[PDB]
Amino acid sequence: TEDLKKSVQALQNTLTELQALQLQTKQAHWNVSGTLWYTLHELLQDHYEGISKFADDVAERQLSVGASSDGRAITIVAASRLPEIPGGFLDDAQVIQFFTYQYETVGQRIHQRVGDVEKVDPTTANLLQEVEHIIEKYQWQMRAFLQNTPTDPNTGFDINNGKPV
Amino acid sequence: TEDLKKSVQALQNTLTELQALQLQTKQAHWNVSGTLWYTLHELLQDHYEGISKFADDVAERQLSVGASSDGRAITIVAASRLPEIPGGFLDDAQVIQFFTYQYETVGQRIHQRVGDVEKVDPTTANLLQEVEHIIEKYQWQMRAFLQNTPTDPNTGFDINNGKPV
Amino acid sequence: TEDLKKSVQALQNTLTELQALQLQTKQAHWNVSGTLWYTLHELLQDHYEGISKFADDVAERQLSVGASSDGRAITIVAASRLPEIPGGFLDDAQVIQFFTYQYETVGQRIHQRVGDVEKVDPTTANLLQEVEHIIEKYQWQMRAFLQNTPTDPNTGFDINNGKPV
Amino acid sequence: TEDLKKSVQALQNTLTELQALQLQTKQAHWNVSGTLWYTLHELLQDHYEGISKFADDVAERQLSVGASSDGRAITIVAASRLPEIPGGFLDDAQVIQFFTYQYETVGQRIHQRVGDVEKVDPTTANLLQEVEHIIEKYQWQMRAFLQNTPTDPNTGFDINNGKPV
Amino acid sequence: TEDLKKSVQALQNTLTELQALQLQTKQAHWNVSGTLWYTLHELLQDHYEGISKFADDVAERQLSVGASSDGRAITIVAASRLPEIPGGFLDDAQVIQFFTYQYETVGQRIHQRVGDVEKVDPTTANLLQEVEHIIEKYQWQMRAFLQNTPTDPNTGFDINNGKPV
Amino acid sequence: TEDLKKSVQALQNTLTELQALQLQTKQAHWNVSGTLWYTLHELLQDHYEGISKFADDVAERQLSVGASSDGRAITIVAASRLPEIPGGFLDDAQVIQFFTYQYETVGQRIHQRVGDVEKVDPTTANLLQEVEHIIEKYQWQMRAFLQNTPTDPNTGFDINNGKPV
Amino acid sequence: TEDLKKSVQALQNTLTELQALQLQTKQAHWNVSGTLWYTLHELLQDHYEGISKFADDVAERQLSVGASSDGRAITIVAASRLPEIPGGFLDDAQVIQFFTYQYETVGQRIHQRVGDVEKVDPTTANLLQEVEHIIEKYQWQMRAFLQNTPTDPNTGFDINNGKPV
Amino acid sequence: TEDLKKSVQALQNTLTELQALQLQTKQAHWNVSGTLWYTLHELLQDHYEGISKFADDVAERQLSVGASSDGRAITIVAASRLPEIPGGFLDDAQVIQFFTYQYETVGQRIHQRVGDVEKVDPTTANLLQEVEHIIEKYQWQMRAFLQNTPTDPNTGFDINNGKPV
Amino acid sequence: TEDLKKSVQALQNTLTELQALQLQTKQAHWNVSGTLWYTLHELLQDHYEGISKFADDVAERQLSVGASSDGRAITIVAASRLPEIPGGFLDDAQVIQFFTYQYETVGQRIHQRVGDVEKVDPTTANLLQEVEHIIEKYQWQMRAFLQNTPTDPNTGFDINNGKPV
Amino acid sequence: TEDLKKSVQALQNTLTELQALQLQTKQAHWNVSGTLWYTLHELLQDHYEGISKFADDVAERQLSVGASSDGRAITIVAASRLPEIPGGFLDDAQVIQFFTYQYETVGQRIHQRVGDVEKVDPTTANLLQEVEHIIEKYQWQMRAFLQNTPTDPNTGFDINNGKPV
Amino acid sequence: TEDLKKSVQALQNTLTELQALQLQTKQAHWNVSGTLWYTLHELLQDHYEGISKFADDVAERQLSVGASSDGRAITIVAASRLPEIPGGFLDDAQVIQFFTYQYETVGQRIHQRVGDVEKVDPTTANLLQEVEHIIEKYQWQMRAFLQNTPTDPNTGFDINNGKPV
Amino acid sequence: TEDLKKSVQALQNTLTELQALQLQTKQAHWNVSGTLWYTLHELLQDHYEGISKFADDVAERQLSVGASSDGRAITIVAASRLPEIPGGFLDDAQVIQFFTYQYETVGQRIHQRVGDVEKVDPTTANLLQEVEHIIEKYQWQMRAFLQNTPTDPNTGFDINNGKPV
Ligand SMILES: [Cl-]
Ligand SMILES: [Cl-]
Ligand SMILES: [Cl-]
Ligand SMILES: [Cl-]
Ligand SMILES: [Cl-]
Ligand SMILES: [Cl-]
Ligand SMILES: [Cl-]
Ligand SMILES: [Cl-]
Ligand SMILES: [Cl-]
Ligand SMILES: [Cl-]
Ligand SMILES: [Cl-]
Ligand SMILES: [Cl-]
Ligand SMILES: [Fe+3]
Ligand SMILES: [Fe+3]
Ligand SMILES: [Fe+3]
Ligand SMILES: [Fe+3]
Ligand SMILES: [Fe+3]
Ligand SMILES: [Fe+3]
Ligand SMILES: [Fe+3]
Ligand SMILES: [Fe+3]
Ligand SMILES: [Fe+3]
Ligand SMILES: [Fe+3]
Ligand SMILES: [Fe+3]
Ligand SMILES: [Fe+3]
Ligand SMILES: [Fe+3]
Ligand SMILES: [Fe+3]
Ligand SMILES: [Fe+3]
Ligand SMILES: [Fe+3]
Ligand SMILES: [Fe+3]
Ligand SMILES: [Fe+3]
Ligand SMILES: [Fe+3]
Ligand SMILES: [Fe+3]
Ligand SMILES: [Fe+3]
Ligand SMILES: [Fe+3]
Ligand SMILES: [Fe+3]
Ligand SMILES: [Fe+3]
Ligand SMILES: [Fe+3]
Ligand SMILES: [Fe+3]
Ligand SMILES: [Fe+3]
Ligand SMILES: [Fe+3]
Ligand SMILES: [Fe+3]
Ligand SMILES: [Fe+3]
Ligand SMILES: [Fe+3]
Ligand SMILES: [Fe+3]
Ligand SMILES: [Fe+3]
Ligand SMILES: [Fe+3]
Ligand SMILES: [Fe+3]
Ligand SMILES: [Fe+3]
Ligand SMILES: [Fe+3]
Ligand SMILES: [Fe+3]
Ligand SMILES: [Fe+3]
Ligand SMILES: [Fe+3]
Ligand SMILES: [Fe+3]
Ligand SMILES: [Fe+3]
Ligand SMILES: [Fe+3]
Ligand SMILES: [Fe+3]
Ligand SMILES: [Fe+3]
Ligand SMILES: [Fe+3]
Ligand SMILES: [Fe+3]
Ligand SMILES: [Fe+3]
Ligand SMILES: [Fe+3]
Ligand SMILES: [Fe+3]
Ligand SMILES: [Fe+3]
Ligand SMILES: [Fe+3]
């Protein structure tokens, strides 16, 4: 059946994306610098925990429908399909920019996956909607730092050495 | 007796002000944007919980001296007597400005109320002093973002698109 | 897109209804009287906490799909579209009657909203199903006080001064 | 030895009675209606937890003296030897009446069992005294709703549509 | 000094009243019967804990200003100056009636005591205001069972065998 | 309406299956023997708690859409429609075999039920997807003991006296 | 039956003794002075909590076998039958002496009561054995301060102004 | 009196046996090896905690009836009267065999002791029944690994290098 | 205004005294010796925590009325105005003597301060009454070690090498 | 300085090894199969948490001595220098074999690193000793499954389809 | 011996530095102002707790090797040997600058002390390495606000009124 | 290798000493008498828990470097090499004297062991430094009861029947 194939594909692809996000949030947690370093250090820890919890649920849902889960380092690298986080000290505006985009792209892809599996496997779809919920919430939490308002454009000039982000 | 009338007036007026503050802190919690969005999101959650706890105490003190408590939406609107929080995305400096002022005006009014009821109802006065304590603490916590220091005026230029707040 | 418009409408309308319910449950929590006053005081506190939690989730889901959330007192009043709770001391049977109806009407409307947004935004639909779940559970918990049984009609005569409710 | 037979009989018969009580308390927890529905819903949850804990202790005491424990649905039905709880919506006075009687009859039987095994197996007797303690406490908690006092017969007329229970 | 005498008198008299209330709430906790027996059993436990906590604070405030505290059974009996709770099974309406009155009279007396010691010993006055706060809250919680409303007089006929309380 | 009939049928049938599973997991918890007795004793306790929690949710969802819930022993026996667990001491491989199958069949049936009620009652469907999620997870947890791998068939010979399971 | 009379007598007499002990331990908790004041203040708090817990169990066991419980102040005074604790500041050696004796006499009496009711009411006997257990443990904890050892008589001279206790 | 002698003997002999068991369970906790090493490591930790708790209760019951408790290493060695646990790495089947026997022999002896002291000291008998309860439960938990079933003899061949245990 | 000056003076002077007390209680916590060393080590830890909590409240009340708080080491030294605690190993009687006096003098001064600010700033007065409450409680807890009783002068001879304190 | 270079090298190399171990333990947690699947699932979760905690400490120690931390997926792959865990369903004996070896090799390398940095950076050495402690403990916990004993070689034949591991 | 002298010197000097840091972190906690006031208020509270915990460990290690600990205010002032924190309102950039430097200098000195005592007193050295660990971590946490990155120098211009820090 | 021999010797010898201390602290916990009996009862419980925790760590470190741990009663007796605690009732001064000495001698020996294994096994050395830390802290806590001060020799005359200890 390509109803098991559909399920596996959607779960496995989401798992890898969450694992990529685990590694990038931690990396940023450690290396972020600037005015918002501590704020972001704390926020990224919370995201990491939420992402880790859903990575474990997604992997065990995969096992639950009868397939092994591939969480290997090689598999994470092989699925790049997503900008990589710079090494070294990272700037607060750079971290914000980076996750605004990553969470948005990951959320979009999960959104597609929910549609794909919804009538063959509504239980897997339900799980993926929960993952999408958290990813899009995290997206807002990064986006909110640069959100345009009636009194202030929020260009990020102050967290970016005078320059818009 | 206008010793029950005094007590009711002081308690009821404080209740409505706290309920107005519940709604405005939550609104700001959701909609705040900019460099300090997350910081303020967390701080406003703490204030909301403190305000909610005292709203419940004030309402039940009113019941305790023998009068019903009016916590209706219509009553909150009817007591405006206090600037309203803008809708839409709100800027961090705008939120700070707004609560610096609201908490100050609410604290002042409670201060007056403590004097009013102190010898007819010292138990109600004691409660209102506790409310004033928390409101003025919250006032300092908003004020501290723009507090002038020997090395830095803290105009809020960085959180306000180059302009003093 | 009127897929963002659909989502915003469903989320915003639900938020206001939950906020209306926050205010009415608390009001009843304070002012309820009679044989079941304490029972209802405790039950209404539990409902208030459940409703408050989902109000926060609904507002932040709205932010998560890119729109501000309107939780203002004026907006609650403006959306009346729902009977208002009496002021003053409220009778236990009156509170029961009132929420049986409110929860039922709010649950119905959320039910409609779930259908409306389900294929444009299954993640928002999932959240609203969770809200509907709790609202309808609360509906049963109010309804159960007057539920007709094989041995007893449960007219509420005992909690209503000899008269059916 | 009919000292193991004695022990097994007393433990097994008590286990089945507790399991019958697990099912009836939950059933009543869900279906109770009327003025005391919520009160009883909460009280029956507490009883269910206490009963469940002792069912587990009784079953594992049976294993501890070297015999398997029969907790099957068929065995519960086979040991009826005890009125069955009506299906459908149940009235508060009906639930109270029902458990007043069930707890009393179960407590009596355990009381007999304590005497039976006390000198062959004082450790099993000790456990059964603890079960009897809780069952008789629960009996008082149901009985107390209809307990005659110097100022009021407590006929249950108010929770029974004008009629004594 | 009769500023220590004033303080001692106010503290000691309050201690005895709280201890009288400890004994009466527990007695009622055990012996209450009728429709509201369990409700009142739980409510009276909460009051007992609040009263016990303040009895300990009042006694240790007495020690703190340099005097021993008399918490003896003989002293409780000697200070009757307050209706005694009936023995035997007590009816729910009887318990409600009884504490409505006791809490009211105790609250009144503490209120007087606050005035008496307020300028010689504002710290003792502060403590007594906290005791008055809780006692009057408990008074409302008993009073609320019989509170007259626009739709229902709440005579207590249902919890009193057809007769107003 | 046969939209309430649909909902009731799906909820009621699931409730009975969960209650059957409550009884069988506990039975196995007590009576399991062999190399994996303690492992399974602990695992079956965890399943029992998860199953019990969802049984309570399913029963109260049934009440929430306006129908009583039938959790009686007779009803559990009447719905057999599912192999019964042996009495006496049960072998670890026998327990594993038994639940691998039970959880699989129960999960399948819930899966069908989700489809059945999904557009008349998406809130009930959502609940049943959560039940299916847990049941299928539990299925994997039993299946994993005998799961074929590249280095070892996992026949269960070691937990079955030399014989494949 | 004088098997209910036996049970009531044993339970009621124990309740009063525990309540007497509640009042005396608290009194000593507040008023104790000297080298061991703080030690004893803490120890007496622990005893008070243990005694309070068993007073509640004894009273509710009395209700459980169908009789009201008399916890009134007048009843405590009426059952003196036991030395009274001095008022005023109490010396550490005096407190130790006093409870060594009280706990011993109360433990003895409960011991007799266990024999009295053991075959009419083994469940009540079991409870009273638990009370005796704690009372005799508390007796050792007071006795241990003056316990004669091979290297030191422990006369209490140091806690008694040079004089043996 | 040889009623104190009886009590002391029963308590002291049980204490030493529990202390012997403390040392053997820990030893096995550390040194166990094989397929069931981790399972047994965890199970033996739980037993150790239960045994330690009762050792403390038994020793303090001894003090409570007026005698010192001998918990010395020399006394443990002197009371051997019980097979000693091998040193070095211990096999899972060896640990299981060993405690099946130890717990059984210790439980038997405590059982005798309960009879011995039951009418001179029912409070000490009650404590020893609680110790026997736990010891026999632990006995079942070890025995269950090798328990014969209708589908599998459970010889332990798999945990014993092909050989029955 | 010298109503802000009054408030600042009272708050600042209390802060410094509490900080002096933080340092002295810890110093004594570490260095106390003798019969009551451990008792006092524990008691002084509790006082330190209570004092630290109020130091933080006093400092933040100062900020709340618009002034900075001076908690510097130099400021603590500059406000000596209070005996200094000896260095080196400190004797139990010396610690008791020392805090009996310190707490008394600090409590007195706070008492004066409460009067000073009570009508310009009742909220600050309320806070200072809470500080006075704890300081005077701590005073009793030190005083109680040497408190004269009808049976024993409590000279402290035993904790002072034969000599009255 | 090549004292910062030394520190960075030792910390960075350890971080990557811990991150490799995070991924492999989770992978095994999900995919392990066979008799010991659940046991190992639980054990590997505990190891994962311990490893994750030290990965965070090692990365933040690196930041603490002034260097960024590289936790990227590419860096984990680039440092292979260590056998990779198979994908697909993994057998219990295979998991045990695999971590016995991995933990041993990682522990050895950390051991070397402790020597390397010990006198330039004893604080980093201290941290690495703590990491080595946990890694070697985990090594024993895997090794213990196959540990040779006087009564049983523990070849793993039972967990490996008749064949030694 | 000047091995006790060495130990005392290293411990005592570290204690004073930690106590200086306790006072400065709290001072900054209260008085910090500007964009990062709340962030720093929270961060400085965490540091204060970590510093307080190690101050207590260092003082009690000093006692453990047989010397008293000097924690007096005079001793803190006497050891200045370290810039003092300004009084009045302090700017966020000023606080960051100040602790970046203080933590660095304190960490350096502890580092030296670890070398000094390492072979006379490795247990004291171990403790001091733990103190150094936390101090240097806190140093990074302050330093990270101004850490230069590839996209942004992080001069602190935004938190310093346009000027580099 | 005699680097494993060194490690084993140091770990095994420490384990036995900690186990000896477990037994002696408990023995003293039970049997201590006199003025400081309760104080010491509590203090010795805390030491016992700290000692037990490190005994478990030391034994599992031994396993971690590849050797079994000998925790047998016979081995404890065989390693006497340390005064034995008297049986019977023990005097407070005797307990203090005894542990002052035991902890000192055990701490000394561990100190030697740290030197012995430090460069072959720094991870084992680190663990032993932690054990030494706690043992020497416990030594101070016993020593502090008799510590000579400028105002009082602390001979223990008061806790020793007039005689210096
Ligand atoms: Cl899980
Ligand atoms: Cl409340
Ligand atoms: Cl949240
Ligand atoms: Cl259990
Ligand atoms: Cl307290
Ligand atoms: Cl619930
Ligand atoms: Cl209870
Ligand atoms: Cl205890
Ligand atoms: Cl705070
Ligand atoms: Cl952290
Ligand atoms: Cl500590
Ligand atoms: Cl562990
Ligand atoms: Fe967090
Ligand atoms: Fe998992
Ligand atoms: Fe999960
Ligand atoms: Fe930046
Ligand atoms: Fe918060
Ligand atoms: Fe409330
Ligand atoms: Fe409250
Ligand atoms: Fe802004
Ligand atoms: Fe609640
Ligand atoms: Fe929120
Ligand atoms: Fe939420
Ligand atoms: Fe959901
Ligand atoms: Fe009514
Ligand atoms: Fe409950
Ligand atoms: Fe169980
Ligand atoms: Fe249990
Ligand atoms: Fe009814
Ligand atoms: Fe309660
Ligand atoms: Fe107290
Ligand atoms: Fe208190
Ligand atoms: Fe009634
Ligand atoms: Fe569990
Ligand atoms: Fe439920
Ligand atoms: Fe639930
Ligand atoms: Fe088997
Ligand atoms: Fe306590
Ligand atoms: Fe109770
Ligand atoms: Fe109880
Ligand atoms: Fe018991
Ligand atoms: Fe004395
Ligand atoms: Fe455990
Ligand atoms: Fe103990
Ligand atoms: Fe215990
Ligand atoms: Fe084996
Ligand atoms: Fe404490
Ligand atoms: Fe603070
Ligand atoms: Fe505070
Ligand atoms: Fe207050
Ligand atoms: Fe002294
Ligand atoms: Fe775990
Ligand atoms: Fe971190
Ligand atoms: Fe950490
Ligand atoms: Fe295998
Ligand atoms: Fe914190
Ligand atoms: Fe300390
Ligand atoms: Fe510490
Ligand atoms: Fe360490
Ligand atoms: Fe600034
Ligand atoms: Fe403790
Ligand atoms: Fe262990
Ligand atoms: Fe440990
Ligand atoms: Fe002595």
Side-chain angles (χ1 to χ4, degrees), chain H residues 152-165:
Chain H
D152 184 340
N154 295 316
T155 63
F157 86 96
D158 61 306
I159 54 166
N160 196 28
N161 194 40
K163 323 192 201 75
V165 170

PDB file of all heavy atoms in Angstrom, chain H residues 152-165:
ATOM      1  N   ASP H 152       4.003 -22.242  29.075  1.00  0.00           N
ATOM      2  CA  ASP H 152       5.459 -22.146  29.240  1.00  0.00           C
ATOM      3  C   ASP H 152       5.854 -22.418  30.696  1.00  0.00           C
ATOM      4  O   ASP H 152       5.444 -21.654  31.598  1.00  0.00           O
ATOM      5  CB  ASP H 152       5.954 -20.753  28.792  1.00  0.00           C
ATOM      6  CG  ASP H 152       7.484 -20.590  28.841  1.00  0.00           C
ATOM      7  OD1 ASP H 152       8.203 -21.339  29.524  1.00  0.00           O
ATOM      8  OD2 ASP H 152       7.985 -19.660  28.191  1.00  0.00           O
ATOM      9  N   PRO H 153       6.640 -23.509  30.930  1.00  0.00           N
ATOM     10  CA  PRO H 153       7.180 -23.893  32.262  1.00  0.00           C
ATOM     11  C   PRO H 153       7.987 -22.803  32.979  1.00  0.00           C
ATOM     12  O   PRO H 153       8.085 -22.846  34.201  1.00  0.00           O
ATOM     13  CB  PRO H 153       8.128 -25.074  31.957  1.00  0.00           C
ATOM     14  CG  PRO H 153       8.297 -25.094  30.492  1.00  0.00           C
ATOM     15  CD  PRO H 153       7.051 -24.476  29.896  1.00  0.00           C
ATOM     16  N   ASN H 154       8.563 -21.863  32.213  1.00  0.00           N
ATOM     17  CA  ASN H 154       9.484 -20.826  32.726  1.00  0.00           C
ATOM     18  C   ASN H 154      10.618 -21.373  33.596  1.00  0.00           C
ATOM     19  O   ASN H 154      10.753 -21.010  34.768  1.00  0.00           O
ATOM     20  CB  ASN H 154       8.716 -19.682  33.423  1.00  0.00           C
ATOM     21  CG  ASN H 154       7.834 -18.897  32.455  1.00  0.00           C
ATOM     22  OD1 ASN H 154       8.260 -18.557  31.344  1.00  0.00           O
ATOM     23  ND2 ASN H 154       6.606 -18.597  32.872  1.00  0.00           N
ATOM     24  N   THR H 155      11.429 -22.248  32.998  1.00  0.00           N
ATOM     25  CA  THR H 155      12.542 -22.935  33.684  1.00  0.00           C
ATOM     26  C   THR H 155      13.708 -21.996  33.964  1.00  0.00           C
ATOM     27  O   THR H 155      14.567 -22.294  34.807  1.00  0.00           O
ATOM     28  CB  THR H 155      13.110 -24.122  32.834  1.00  0.00           C
ATOM     29  OG1 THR H 155      13.655 -23.616  31.603  1.00  0.00           O
ATOM     30  CG2 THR H 155      12.023 -25.183  32.542  1.00  0.00           C
ATOM     31  N   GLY H 156      13.739 -20.880  33.229  1.00  0.00           N
ATOM     32  CA  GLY H 156      14.835 -19.926  33.295  1.00  0.00           C
ATOM     33  C   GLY H 156      16.014 -20.298  32.414  1.00  0.00           C
ATOM     34  O   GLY H 156      17.101 -19.718  32.543  1.00  0.00           O
ATOM     35  N   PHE H 157      15.797 -21.267  31.517  1.00  0.00           N
ATOM     36  CA  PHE H 157      16.848 -21.750  30.603  1.00  0.00           C
ATOM     37  C   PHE H 157      17.521 -20.598  29.834  1.00  0.00           C
ATOM     38  O   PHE H 157      18.741 -20.595  29.639  1.00  0.00           O
ATOM     39  CB  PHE H 157      16.289 -22.823  29.632  1.00  0.00           C
ATOM     40  CG  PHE H 157      15.650 -22.256  28.378  1.00  0.00           C
ATOM     41  CD1 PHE H 157      16.383 -22.143  27.196  1.00  0.00           C
ATOM     42  CD2 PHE H 157      14.316 -21.836  28.382  1.00  0.00           C
ATOM     43  CE1 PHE H 157      15.801 -21.608  26.040  1.00  0.00           C
ATOM     44  CE2 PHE H 157      13.726 -21.299  27.236  1.00  0.00           C
ATOM     45  CZ  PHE H 157      14.467 -21.187  26.065  1.00  0.00           C
ATOM     46  N   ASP H 158      16.707 -19.631  29.402  1.00  0.00           N
ATOM     47  CA  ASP H 158      17.173 -18.465  28.635  1.00  0.00           C
ATOM     48  C   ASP H 158      18.060 -17.509  29.461  1.00  0.00           C
ATOM     49  O   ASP H 158      18.979 -16.878  28.921  1.00  0.00           O
ATOM     50  CB  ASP H 158      15.974 -17.715  28.042  1.00  0.00           C
ATOM     51  CG  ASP H 158      15.015 -17.176  29.119  1.00  0.00           C
ATOM     52  OD1 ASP H 158      14.555 -17.974  29.990  1.00  0.00           O
ATOM     53  OD2 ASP H 158      14.724 -15.950  29.074  1.00  0.00           O
ATOM     54  N   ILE H 159      17.798 -17.422  30.765  1.00  0.00           N
ATOM     55  CA  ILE H 159      18.593 -16.560  31.652  1.00  0.00           C
ATOM     56  C   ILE H 159      19.662 -17.344  32.433  1.00  0.00           C
ATOM     57  O   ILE H 159      20.265 -16.819  33.377  1.00  0.00           O
ATOM     58  CB  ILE H 159      17.699 -15.693  32.607  1.00  0.00           C
ATOM     59  CG1 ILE H 159      16.728 -16.575  33.403  1.00  0.00           C
ATOM     60  CG2 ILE H 159      16.975 -14.612  31.804  1.00  0.00           C
ATOM     61  CD1 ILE H 159      16.060 -15.902  34.582  1.00  0.00           C
ATOM     62  N   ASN H 160      19.898 -18.587  32.007  1.00  0.00           N
ATOM     63  CA  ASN H 160      20.801 -19.496  32.713  1.00  0.00           C
ATOM     64  C   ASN H 160      21.716 -20.371  31.814  1.00  0.00           C
ATOM     65  O   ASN H 160      22.199 -21.439  32.237  1.00  0.00           O
ATOM     66  CB  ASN H 160      19.993 -20.349  33.699  1.00  0.00           C
ATOM     67  CG  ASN H 160      20.863 -21.036  34.723  1.00  0.00           C
ATOM     68  OD1 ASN H 160      21.934 -20.544  35.066  1.00  0.00           O
ATOM     69  ND2 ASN H 160      20.412 -22.195  35.205  1.00  0.00           N
ATOM     70  N   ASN H 161      21.966 -19.913  30.586  1.00  0.00           N
ATOM     71  CA  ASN H 161      22.881 -20.615  29.682  1.00  0.00           C
ATOM     72  C   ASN H 161      22.340 -22.013  29.276  1.00  0.00           C
ATOM     73  O   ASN H 161      23.060 -23.018  29.315  1.00  0.00           O
ATOM     74  CB  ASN H 161      24.288 -20.692  30.320  1.00  0.00           C
ATOM     75  CG  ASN H 161      25.385 -21.085  29.324  1.00  0.00           C
ATOM     76  OD1 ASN H 161      25.399 -20.636  28.174  1.00  0.00           O
ATOM     77  ND2 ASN H 161      26.328 -21.912  29.785  1.00  0.00           N
ATOM     78  N   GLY H 162      21.060 -22.058  28.905  1.00  0.00           N
ATOM     79  CA  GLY H 162      20.408 -23.291  28.449  1.00  0.00           C
ATOM     80  C   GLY H 162      19.886 -24.232  29.530  1.00  0.00           C
ATOM     81  O   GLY H 162      19.092 -25.133  29.235  1.00  0.00           O
ATOM     82  N   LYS H 163      20.321 -24.029  30.777  1.00  0.00           N
ATOM     83  CA  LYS H 163      20.002 -24.942  31.878  1.00  0.00           C
ATOM     84  C   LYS H 163      18.850 -24.424  32.749  1.00  0.00           C
ATOM     85  O   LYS H 163      18.803 -23.235  33.055  1.00  0.00           O
ATOM     86  CB  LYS H 163      21.234 -25.177  32.763  1.00  0.00           C
ATOM     87  CG  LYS H 163      22.567 -25.261  32.019  1.00  0.00           C
ATOM     88  CD  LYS H 163      23.688 -25.778  32.929  1.00  0.00           C
ATOM     89  CE  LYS H 163      25.077 -25.394  32.395  1.00  0.00           C
ATOM     90  NZ  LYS H 163      25.406 -23.938  32.623  1.00  0.00           N
ATOM     91  N   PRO H 164      17.923 -25.321  33.158  1.00  0.00           N
ATOM     92  CA  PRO H 164      16.899 -24.973  34.153  1.00  0.00           C
ATOM     93  C   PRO H 164      17.539 -24.402  35.423  1.00  0.00           C
ATOM     94  O   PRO H 164      18.683 -24.743  35.738  1.00  0.00           O
ATOM     95  CB  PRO H 164      16.220 -26.318  34.443  1.00  0.00           C
ATOM     96  CG  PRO H 164      16.409 -27.109  33.196  1.00  0.00           C
ATOM     97  CD  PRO H 164      17.774 -26.714  32.686  1.00  0.00           C
ATOM     98  N   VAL H 165      16.815 -23.541  36.139  1.00  0.00           N
ATOM     99  CA  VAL H 165      17.408 -22.809  37.271  1.00  0.00           C
ATOM    100  C   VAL H 165      17.486 -23.655  38.559  1.00  0.00           C
ATOM    101  O   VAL H 165      18.558 -23.751  39.177  1.00  0.00           O
ATOM    102  CB  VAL H 165      16.728 -21.415  37.498  1.00  0.00           C
ATOM    103  CG1 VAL H 165      17.177 -20.766  38.820  1.00  0.00           C
ATOM    104  CG2 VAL H 165      17.038 -20.487  36.337  1.00  0.00           C
TER     105      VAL H 165
END
